[PDB]
């Protein structure tokens, strides 16, 4: 199961 | 061992922000990405979960999760925060009705999809353990 | 409607004692009564309401809970405590998936559903309050 899952990401304080 | 009571205090504890969490990403996405999951391992974090996953999840536990993709598909998230706990070879459901509903909780809170993210995954770090 | 915030927290405080009295009464009847509601007045006590009752009640303005009777129909009662807390005519919904879940709850308390109710009653007494 944990394969198929997809991470949910801040999108970052970009440079 | 100790992760259902762990999860399950850290979620009464911060049901507002995860109402938020829950409703910006609805926000963003509707169902689009699928279910938001907690997956605890290797540390805890937030995961998009496809029905498709749900589905092959549950043909290999032999439908002893069919009524989670019934909750899935019913879920008013207006006034249901709805997801996926994620253990060692366990799923736990998280569903609550919180107050204010989840949009105003978006709203009061006043952060971000990325604060939001970032301030629990930090909560959970070291308080749930698998 | 600070009502709806100080039920709210005792809820949260209390899922466990909920869950069981939720799993005590619904092994007594089914959906046969209706919903378990929590009338808050005078004082805050646990009330049956049918169907149609909750029905009328939520489509007045005041409410108009968005598919409510549906998330009603489609709580599963071994995973996920659902009642309704009633005060001046306004619905809040009360829904949460307890650890562990309300069967196991019950079963920890015994077959004492008479004193687990005037227990969260008195409790409510003191803990909703204008």
Not at chain 2, 57 to 85: A, D, K, S, Y
Not at chain 2, 106 to 122: A, N, P, S, W
Request: net charge negative; aromatic share 8%.
């Amino acid at each position: 199961f944990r394969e198929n899952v997809n991470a949910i990401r801040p999108f970052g304080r970009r440079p | 061992s100790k992760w259902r009571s762990q999860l399950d205090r850290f979620v009464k504890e911060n049901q507002q922000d995860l109402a938020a969490l829950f409703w910006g990403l609805w926000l963003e996405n509707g169902d689009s990405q699928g279910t938001i999951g907690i997956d605890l391992q290797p540390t805890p974090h937030f995961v998009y979960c496809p029905k498709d996953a749900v589905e092959k999840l549950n043909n290999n536990v032999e439908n002893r999760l069919q009524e989670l993709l019934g909750i899935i598909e019913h879920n008013q998230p207006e006034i249901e925060v709805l997801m996926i706990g994620i253990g060692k070879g366990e799923i736990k459901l998280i569903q609550f009705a919180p107050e204010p509903p989840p949009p105003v909780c978006f709203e009061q809170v006043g952060k971000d999809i990325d604060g939001l993210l970032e301030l629990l995954e930090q909560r959970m770090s070291g308080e749930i353990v698998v």
